[PDB]
Amino acid sequence: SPADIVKNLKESMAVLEKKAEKATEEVSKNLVAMKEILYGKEPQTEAVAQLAQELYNSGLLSTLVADLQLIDFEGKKDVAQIFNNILRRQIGTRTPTVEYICTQQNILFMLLKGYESPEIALNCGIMLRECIRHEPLAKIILWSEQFYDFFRYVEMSTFDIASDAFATFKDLLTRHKLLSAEFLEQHYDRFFSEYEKLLHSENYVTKRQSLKLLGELLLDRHNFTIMTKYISKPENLKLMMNLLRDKSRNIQFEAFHVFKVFVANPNKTQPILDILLKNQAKLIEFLSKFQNDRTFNDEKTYLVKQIRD
Amino acid sequence: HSRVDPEELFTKLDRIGKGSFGEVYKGIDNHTKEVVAIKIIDLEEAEDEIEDIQQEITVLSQCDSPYITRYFGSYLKSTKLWIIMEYLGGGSALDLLKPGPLEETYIATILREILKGLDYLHSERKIHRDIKAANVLLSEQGDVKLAAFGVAGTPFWMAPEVIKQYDFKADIWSLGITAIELAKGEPPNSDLHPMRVLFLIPKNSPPTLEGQHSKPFKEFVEACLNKDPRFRPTAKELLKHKFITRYTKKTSFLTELIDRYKRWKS
Ligand SMILES: CCN(CC)CCNC(=O)c1c(C)[nH]c(/C=C2\C(=O)Nc3ccc(Cl)cc32)c1C
C-alpha cells in the first residue's frame, strides 16, 4: 500500500539528515516503489490517488526537495519523475497538486535555489520547468525577488547548468503571455536594466541567446506596449546599431532582427529620428553589403526605402 | 565556483586521442590534483546551431555506470567549451591490437564488458551510435569502458538498416563487426573505400568470421550480424552466450594487454 511506502520513505529520509547505508538502501528502494505505482503493467487509478493524498498529508514532497542532495544519483532522477507525474494529475477541471504547491510556496523557492548546488541543479530544473507550465505556480516565481537571481544563473559559467536556467527563464516570459506582458509592463525599468547587461556580456552563447529572446519578446503581440516603449529609447537603437558591426556573424545577424523593429515603427520619436538621419548614408551602404548569402534581402531593401524617406 | 575561467581550476598538459576525438587533452584538477580528460570544443561559429550540443552533454549527465566514461562537468568562458571527463590511461582496445593478435580468452572478456555497457545504455533508452575498437577504452586496472561522444557514424561498423535510414539493434550489429575486428585487427571490407562499403552493406550478405577460430566465436558473430534487426539478440541475451559464459576471466586479467603495448612502444 502507498500509505506504507510513504511512511517507510519518510522515516528513512529522517535518518540521513558508517551506520547510514541502510537508510540509503531503503530510500533508493522506496523511490523505485513509488515510480512503479505512477507508471507500472499500467498504473492503477486508485493507487496513484492514495499515493498523492498521502504525499500531501505527510508533506513528503517538501521533504524530498529540501534534502535532495542526500539522495543518490538514480534517486534524484526518480524523484523528478515522481514529482512531475503527480503535478500533472487532474481531478476534473482542477489540479490538486498545483493547489497544494500554492499552499507550500517554499517548494518553488527550494527548486529555484537548487541552481546554486551543482549536484542537484540539473534535477531542480526539470522539476521547475514543469511547475511553471501551470500559471498559478509560474506567477509566484515571476513576481518573486528570486526571479532576478536568473540573471546570475544564466552566466554561471557552468554550461550544463546555465542554459538549463535559461530555458526556464524563457519559459517564464513566453508561455503565459498575458502573465508575462503584465509583469514586463510594470517591471519594465528594472528588468530591461538587468537584461541590458546580458547584451554586454562576455559570453558568445549568453549574448546571442538573449538577443534571440529579445527579438521574440518585442515581436509578440502581447508585449506591444513594452515594444513601443523599447523602440522609442535612443540608446536601444544605438545598441542594436553597434551590434550590427564587429565580432560575430550570428550576433550581428540577430541584431538585424531587432533593429528592423525600430525602423518599422510608424510612430517614431524625434530622438529616434535624429539618430537615423545623422547616420543616414552609412546605413544605406552597410545594408547593401550586409552579409551576404542564402537568407532576407527583400527586408534589406524596404529598410533602405524607409531610411531614404 | 560560478563565473570563473576553466583554466583557473583545470590545466592542460599533453594531447591524447591523436586528433581522433575533437581536440582532447590530458589534465589535472588544481584542487584535487587528480587526472582527467579535457575536451575543448570551439563555439564561435564552429559551430553555432550546433547549440544542440547539450544533447551530448545532457545525456552524458544522465549516464551513471562503471562501464561508461563518467561525465564530471562542462565549463565555458565565451568561446571554447571545456568538457571534463574520466581518464583512462590504459588506452583503447585498438591500441592493444597494435602489438599483436589477441587470444580468445581476452576477446571473450572484453566483449563481456562491452555488453554490460550496452546493457546500461539500452536500458536507459540511449543509443551509442558508434561502436568500435577505437571507442572501447581500458583503465590501468583493466576496466573496460565504452566511449561517450555520440550517445543518444563510421561506415564499416554500420548496420544496413541505418544506411538506408538507428534502433538499439544497430549497436548489436556494430558489436558483431567489432568482434571480427578483435579477431582480425580490422573490420570486414577494410581495404575498400568507405563510400563503396556504404553501398555494399545493405545489399550483400552479413560478414562472417572465417579462419582458424572456435565455433562459439563464429556463432557469436553470426548471431549479432543479422540483416534482420528483429533476429539480433539483446545486450542481456549475449551475456549468456556460449562464447561469453565459457571464459570467466576477470577484468584485471586484461592488464596483460596493457603491459604488452607499453613494451611494444620502445
Ligand atoms: C601510450 C598511449 N598509446 C599511444 C597514444 C595509446 C593510448 N592513447 C592515448 O594516449 C589515450 C589516453 C591516455 N586516453 C585516451 C582516451 C580517453 C581518456 O583518457 N579519457 C577519456 C574519456 C572519454 C573518452 Cl570517449 C575517451 C577518453 C586515448 C586515445
Short mmCIF file of N, CA and C in Angstrom, two decimals, chain A residues 108 131-144 147 170-187 191 217 220 222-223 226:
data_model
loop_
_atom_site.label_atom_id
_atom_site.label_comp_id
_atom_site.label_asym_id
_atom_site.label_seq_id
_atom_site.Cartn_x
_atom_site.Cartn_y
_atom_site.Cartn_z
N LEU A 108 8.77 25.82 -4.33
CA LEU A 108 9.20 26.51 -5.54
C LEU A 108 10.53 27.23 -5.33
N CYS A 131 6.62 22.97 -13.21
CA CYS A 131 5.75 23.77 -12.36
C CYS A 131 5.27 25.03 -13.08
N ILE A 132 6.17 25.67 -13.82
CA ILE A 132 5.86 26.92 -14.49
C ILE A 132 4.97 26.73 -15.72
N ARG A 133 4.63 25.49 -16.02
CA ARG A 133 3.66 25.21 -17.07
C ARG A 133 2.27 25.57 -16.56
N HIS A 134 2.12 25.56 -15.24
CA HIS A 134 0.89 25.98 -14.59
C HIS A 134 1.00 27.45 -14.21
N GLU A 135 0.03 28.25 -14.64
CA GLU A 135 0.05 29.69 -14.41
C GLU A 135 0.11 30.13 -12.93
N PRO A 136 -0.67 29.49 -12.04
CA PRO A 136 -0.57 29.90 -10.63
C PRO A 136 0.84 29.71 -10.05
N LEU A 137 1.54 28.66 -10.47
CA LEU A 137 2.89 28.41 -9.98
C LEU A 137 3.90 29.32 -10.66
N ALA A 138 3.69 29.59 -11.94
CA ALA A 138 4.58 30.46 -12.70
C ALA A 138 4.44 31.91 -12.26
N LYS A 139 3.30 32.24 -11.66
CA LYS A 139 3.03 33.60 -11.21
C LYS A 139 3.78 33.91 -9.91
N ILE A 140 3.83 32.93 -9.02
CA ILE A 140 4.51 33.07 -7.74
C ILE A 140 5.99 33.41 -7.94
N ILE A 141 6.62 32.69 -8.86
CA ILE A 141 8.04 32.88 -9.15
C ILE A 141 8.30 34.20 -9.88
N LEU A 142 7.43 34.52 -10.83
CA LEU A 142 7.61 35.70 -11.68
C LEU A 142 7.61 37.00 -10.88
N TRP A 143 6.71 37.12 -9.92
CA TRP A 143 6.63 38.32 -9.09
C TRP A 143 7.44 38.20 -7.80
N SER A 144 8.27 37.16 -7.73
CA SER A 144 9.15 36.97 -6.58
C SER A 144 10.49 37.65 -6.84
N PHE A 147 13.25 35.71 -8.74
CA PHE A 147 13.22 35.68 -10.20
C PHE A 147 14.42 36.42 -10.78
N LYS A 170 13.20 31.56 -20.25
CA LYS A 170 12.39 31.81 -21.43
C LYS A 170 10.95 31.34 -21.21
N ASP A 171 10.81 30.19 -20.57
CA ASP A 171 9.50 29.57 -20.36
C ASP A 171 8.64 30.40 -19.41
N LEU A 172 9.28 31.24 -18.60
CA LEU A 172 8.57 32.11 -17.68
C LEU A 172 8.10 33.39 -18.36
N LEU A 173 8.76 33.76 -19.44
CA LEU A 173 8.49 35.02 -20.12
C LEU A 173 7.74 34.85 -21.44
N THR A 174 7.48 33.60 -21.82
CA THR A 174 6.88 33.32 -23.13
C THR A 174 5.62 32.46 -23.07
N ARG A 175 5.58 31.51 -22.14
CA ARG A 175 4.46 30.58 -22.04
C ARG A 175 3.15 31.28 -21.71
N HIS A 176 3.08 31.85 -20.51
CA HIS A 176 1.90 32.61 -20.10
C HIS A 176 2.05 34.06 -20.54
N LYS A 177 1.56 34.35 -21.74
CA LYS A 177 1.80 35.64 -22.38
C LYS A 177 1.12 36.82 -21.68
N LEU A 178 -0.11 36.62 -21.24
CA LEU A 178 -0.83 37.67 -20.51
C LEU A 178 -0.19 37.91 -19.15
N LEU A 179 0.36 36.84 -18.57
CA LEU A 179 1.03 36.93 -17.28
C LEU A 179 2.38 37.64 -17.43
N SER A 180 3.09 37.32 -18.50
CA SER A 180 4.40 37.90 -18.76
C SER A 180 4.30 39.36 -19.17
N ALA A 181 3.32 39.67 -20.02
CA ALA A 181 3.12 41.03 -20.50
C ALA A 181 2.77 41.98 -19.36
N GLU A 182 2.02 41.48 -18.38
CA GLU A 182 1.65 42.27 -17.22
C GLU A 182 2.87 42.58 -16.36
N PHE A 183 3.75 41.59 -16.23
CA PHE A 183 4.97 41.73 -15.44
C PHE A 183 5.94 42.71 -16.09
N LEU A 184 6.14 42.57 -17.40
CA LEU A 184 7.05 43.44 -18.13
C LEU A 184 6.52 44.87 -18.20
N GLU A 185 5.20 45.01 -18.21
CA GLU A 185 4.56 46.32 -18.25
C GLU A 185 4.86 47.12 -16.99
N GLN A 186 4.95 46.43 -15.86
CA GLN A 186 5.17 47.08 -14.57
C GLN A 186 6.65 47.13 -14.19
N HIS A 187 7.34 46.01 -14.38
CA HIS A 187 8.75 45.91 -14.02
C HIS A 187 9.67 46.23 -15.20
N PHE A 191 13.79 45.33 -15.08
CA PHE A 191 14.05 44.13 -15.87
C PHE A 191 15.00 44.40 -17.03
N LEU A 217 10.35 38.56 -27.77
CA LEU A 217 9.56 39.31 -26.80
C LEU A 217 8.91 40.56 -27.39
N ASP A 220 6.19 39.78 -30.13
CA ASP A 220 4.96 39.14 -29.65
C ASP A 220 3.84 40.17 -29.50
N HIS A 222 1.45 40.45 -27.52
CA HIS A 222 1.04 40.78 -26.16
C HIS A 222 1.96 41.81 -25.52
N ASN A 223 3.23 41.81 -25.94
CA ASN A 223 4.20 42.76 -25.42
C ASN A 223 4.33 43.98 -26.32
N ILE A 226 5.23 47.16 -24.32
CA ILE A 226 6.63 47.03 -23.94
C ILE A 226 7.53 47.32 -25.14
#
